[PDB]
Amino acid sequence: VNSFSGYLKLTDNVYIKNADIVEEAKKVKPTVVVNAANVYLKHGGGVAGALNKATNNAMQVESDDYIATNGPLKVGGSCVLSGHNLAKHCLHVVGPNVNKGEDIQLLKSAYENFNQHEVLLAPLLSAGIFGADPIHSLRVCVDTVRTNVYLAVFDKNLYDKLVSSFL
Question: Which of 26, 49, 133, 152 could anchor a disulfide with 19, C-beta 3.0 to 4.6 Å?
Fold first, then answer.
């Protein structure tokens, strides 16, 4: 039993809710919240900008030190940093950004990072300003992630479409 509430069950291990991931993280304080990161951990907009704003920019400060030490992430890669006031840990995962021409096949590699964590609160990777089809992202998620993932979808209209079209 865990504290996630109001989710629709899609599969044995994948759950989905129309929710703001920031508010969901603030209430649940999950062990892991996933950020929709880029390789530079520049949290300007989308999910990343919202999560970072909720940490009062502490996420960005920590991220800048990480990059200064380690260099950029790979597309499809991840790193574990602090969850600040939102979660114990933040798993920063880089899905391909279609608006930069990155290969969508890397979306599966991105979701594989979730398997290193037993339970996660997450957005749909490569959705929103990353330009991929969210229906496709949900399919890759279900077909790749084997650990327990609680997906937060900000847009109510998109949430309903994702549920109604789910196979």
Answer: 152
